Amino acid sequence: SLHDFTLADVYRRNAALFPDRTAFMVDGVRLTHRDYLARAERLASGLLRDGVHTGDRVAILSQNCSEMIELIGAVALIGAILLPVNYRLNADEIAFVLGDGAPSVVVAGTDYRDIVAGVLPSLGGVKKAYAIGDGSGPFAPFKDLASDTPFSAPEFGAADGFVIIHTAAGRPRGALISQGNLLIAQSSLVDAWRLTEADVNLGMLPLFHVTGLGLMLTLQQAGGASVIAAKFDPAQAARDIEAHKVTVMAEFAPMLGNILDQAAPAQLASLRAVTGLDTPETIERFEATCPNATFWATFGQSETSGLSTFAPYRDRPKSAGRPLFWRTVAVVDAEDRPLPPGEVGEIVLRGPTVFKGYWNNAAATQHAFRNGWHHTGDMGRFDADGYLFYAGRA
Amino acid sequence: SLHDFTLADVYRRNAALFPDRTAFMVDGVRLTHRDYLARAERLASGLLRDGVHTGDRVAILSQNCSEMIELIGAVALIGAILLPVNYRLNADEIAFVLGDGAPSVVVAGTDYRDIVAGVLPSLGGVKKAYAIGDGSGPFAPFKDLASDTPFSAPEFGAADGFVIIHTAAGRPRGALISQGNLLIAQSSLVDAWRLTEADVNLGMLPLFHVTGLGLMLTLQQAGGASVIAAKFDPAQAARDIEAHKVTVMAEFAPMLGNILDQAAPAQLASLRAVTGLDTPETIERFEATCPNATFWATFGQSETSGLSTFAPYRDRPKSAGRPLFWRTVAVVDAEDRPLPPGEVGEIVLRGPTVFKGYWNNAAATQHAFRNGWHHTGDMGRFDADGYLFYAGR
Numbered sequence: 187s188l189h190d191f192t193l194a195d196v197y198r199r200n201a202a203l204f205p206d207r208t209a210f211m212v213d214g215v216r217l218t219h220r221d222y223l224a225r226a227e228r229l230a231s232g233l234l235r236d237g238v239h240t241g242d243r244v245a246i247l248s249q250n251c252s253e254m255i256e257l258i259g260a261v262a263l264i265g266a267i268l269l270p271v272n273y274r275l276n277a278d279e280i281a282f283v284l285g286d287g288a289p290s291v292v293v294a295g296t297d298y299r300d301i302v303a304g305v306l307p308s309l310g311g312v313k314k315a316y317a318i319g320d321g322s323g324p325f326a327p328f329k330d331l332a333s334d335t336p337f338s339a340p341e342f343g344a345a346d347g348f349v350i351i352h353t354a355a356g357r358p359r360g361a362l363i364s365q366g367n368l369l370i371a372q373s374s375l376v377d378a379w380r381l382t383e384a385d386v387n388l389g390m391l392p393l394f395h396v397t398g399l400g401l402m403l404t405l406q407q408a409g410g411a412s413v414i415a416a417k418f419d420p421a422q423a424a425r426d427i428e429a430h431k432v433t434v435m436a437e438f439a440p441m442l443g444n445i446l447d448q449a450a451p452a453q454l455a456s457l458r459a460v461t462g463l464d465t466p467e468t469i470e471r472f473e474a475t476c477p478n479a480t481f482w483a484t485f486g487q488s489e490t491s492g493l494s495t496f497a498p499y500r501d502r503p504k505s506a507g508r509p510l511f512w513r514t515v516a517v518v519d520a521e522d523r524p525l526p527p528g529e530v531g532e533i534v535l536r537g538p539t540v541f542k543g544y545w546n547n548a549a550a551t552q553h554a555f556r557n558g559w560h561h562t563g564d565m566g567r568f569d570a571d572g573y574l575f576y577a578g579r580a
Numbered sequence: 581s582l583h584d585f586t587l588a589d590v591y592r593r594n595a596a597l598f599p600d601r602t603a604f605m606v607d608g609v610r611l612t613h614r615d616y617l618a619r620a621e622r623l624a625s626g627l628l629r630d631g632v633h634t635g636d637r638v639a640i641l642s643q644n645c646s647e648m649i650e651l652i653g654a655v656a657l658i659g660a661i662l663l664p665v666n667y668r669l670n671a672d673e674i675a676f677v678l679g680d681g682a683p684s685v686v687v688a689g690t691d692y693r694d695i696v697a698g699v700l701p702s703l704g705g706v707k708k709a710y711a712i713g714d715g716s717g718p719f720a721p722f723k724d725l726a727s728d729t730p731f732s733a734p735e736f737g738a739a740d741g742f743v744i745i746h747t748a749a750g751r752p753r754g755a756l757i758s759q760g761n762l763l764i765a766q767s768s769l770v771d772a773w774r775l776t777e778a779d780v781n782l783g784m785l786p787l788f789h790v791t792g793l794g795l796m797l798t799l800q801q802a803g804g805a806s807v808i809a810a811k812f813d814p815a816q817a818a819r820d821i822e823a824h825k826v827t828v829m830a831e832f833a834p835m836l837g838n839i840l841d842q843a844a845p846a847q848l849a850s851l852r853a854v855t856g857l858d859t860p861e862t863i864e865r866f867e868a869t870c871p872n873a874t875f876w877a878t879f880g881q882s883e884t885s886g887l888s889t890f891a892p893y894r895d896r897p898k899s900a901g902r903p904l905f906w907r908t909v910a911v912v913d914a915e916d917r918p919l920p921p922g923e924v925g926e927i928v929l930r931g932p933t934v935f936k937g938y939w940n941n942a943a944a945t946q947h948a949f950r951n952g953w954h955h956t957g958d959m960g961r962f963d964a965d966g967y968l969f970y971a972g973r
């Protein structure tokens with residue numbers, strides 16, 4: 187414990203150093219660092235009250251909202267494991283994810299109270315269930331979760347599981363990622379983007395996804411702010427960028443293209459750094475429109491706690507960037523021998539950004555970790571300067 | 581160790597991404613990142629040949645030089661523990677320090693062959709003894725450490741001990757610091773000073789000291805370079821700042837004052853960041869002379885892997901700055917209850933920059949770590965913005 191720094195320590199840090207600064211702008215309401223810690227502490231006492239211990243799962247099926255954001259914090263404060271369910275899955279897949287994760291507490295969103303109610307009798311040690319809105323069905327209302335019992339934090343470390351992120355393999359496979367994985371991975375983003383408490387993220391990606399969750403947690407570790415909305419609208423995005431002076435964002439095609447369509451260049455003047463998956467055409471268009479902004483080429487996955495390689499796109503167009511500090515990246519042949527510059531092989535990783543392993547799946551983990559390298563399942567090549575070029579799936 | 585990233589990984593990173601950039605300038609002798617790795621591996625392979633295992637100590641008593649810099653890397657590569665001896669100590673203290681660390685290899689600097697040979701018969705497990713430069717008496721020449729056997733790294737973690745730094749309790753006490761402690765602590769400095777591979781340190785402090793070693797390793801982490809000299813000369817420092825385009829340095833008073841005396845304002849133009857310990861008079865003098873440079877207020881010690889608190893001096897003059905990321909800093913009661921802002925107490929620390937504990941001194945370690953906080957031995961207070969003000973020992 188003495189040598190640990192966790193997300194709990196970030197929330198307390200932000201409440202101490204930047205208490206009155208914005209943490210979140212979410213559905214028309216402002217939440218400061220001081221008030222975020224207070225709300226998270228209340229919900230954390232409630233989870234403890236409900237009988238959640240360190241290592242237990244807390245599930246949420248919900249679109250991005252203030253309740254989800256403060257629940258993320260509450261889970262972090264007691265060393266529990268978040269199970270954010272992908273709401274673009276069908277009722278069978280959701281049932282699988284929930285059963286695979288085995289939560290002690292389930293939280294249903296406004297639009298998802300039905301689907302969750304169907305799954306709930308098939309779940310074992312689920313102690314309490316909540317809904318955001320009101321408790322129509324087997325759920326209590328979410329406001330019942332919070333407790334006034336003064337919060338006393340259980341014992342846990344940064345290496346303990348924090349989140350299970352399922353991505354479809356076949357069956358969905360849950361990637362267990364620690365608090366420390368994320369903090370250390372994201373410290374490199376803070377550095378590359380010169381993030382400070384003045385910075386502002388436009389959180390348009392879902393918080394169940396590694397990039398969405400990761401970008402929020404990144405700005406939070408800088409003491410900065412995220413603008414979070416439930417749904418993506420290109421024109422609303424452009425207005426948010428101007429209104430809140432958004433400096434950074436992550437995006438997947440066609441989001442940036444669609445914002446560029448709907449935005450006057452003058453609305454986007456505060457943008458400094460953008461990343462994600464996009465075409466050379468859109469990236470070059472974006473950089474043309476916004477001369478003071480840089481698009482950042484990247485490769486990563488949930489198993490690598492988000493970003494692994496990163497660089498300004500202009501430094502090496504069509505690449506995925508250079509390996510970040512904390513990451514040793516190689517490209518190997520079928521028997522894990524490192525290949526020379528130019529040759530295509532499997533992208534492999536070592537270091538503290540490698541995830542803990544696959545939930546409920548010793549076989550998949552053993553395969554991922556063969557010969558002491560994490561295996562991405564992705565193909566690529568390095569150039570002479572150590573830039574990675576993504577070459578597809580294996 | 582699938583999950584480990586150590587100093588070894590830094591060297592291999594730098595050789596992969598910045599092979600032809602300067603890693604070091606040691607009295608005009610240039611070393612690139614690729615060459616540094618090549619040299620460190622040959623020395624590490626030689627350390628193994630001599631029978632050094634992970635966790636064994638390699639001692640050095642020397643002023644700053646290229647041999648010492650390469651040795652630090654060799655030791656890092658095999659998970660050994662460096663014992664850099666403070667050369668400003670008397671023969672009794674050096675004897676004590678060398679005995680406390682119980683090294684398996686001893687390296688004597690050219691000026692220190694006699695002191696080290698004095699202590700050598702009293703040491704238990706010394707497999708090999710070397711001297712920097714020409715071989716003399718019990719010492720083989722340092723050049724003999726290198727081996728041509730292809731380097732094969734042992735298994736070790738970032739959390740394993742890496743260096744023992746002795747500071748007086750009167751009797752010297754050795755802080756054991758991991759590779760991980762240093763990398764994580766110094767990553768905050770890379771971030772705060774916007775260090776990239778273009779940056780250049782003027783390493784004027786001894787490498788046995790946490791600030792000196794920390795700065796070298798910080799610039800190395802960023803892929804930058806250090807200009808390192810055996811001794812401090814203010815006039816030479818001014819020339820080096822100009823010739824090598826030094827962007828950053830740490831300094832202890834009166835070093836910066838003396839440089840300012842000897843430098844044309846024009847020679848100091850590349851400088852953008854300075855930290856260390858100095859008077860308000862000299863700091864303001866420096867910032868007046870160099871308008872594009874910033875002096876950074878700081879507090880730290882060996883037991884906190886170097887710097888703990890950091891901020892531009894102008895943001896809160898006479899403070900020690902704000903706690904860095906990775907540090908949980910508080911000021912406490914004698915009962916270890918945290919004090920409200922304003923109240924003077926003992927500076928305490930949690931987090932991954934906290935050292936491993938004192939070498940062979942469980943009583944001192946237990947006292948340092950009481951109630952799950954590391955205790956600095958220093959008094960201070962926080963203001964309402966969370967700036968720390970240092971208030972004595």
Ligand SMILES: [Cl-]
Nearest residue numbers: 903907908909
């Ligand atoms: Cl703090």
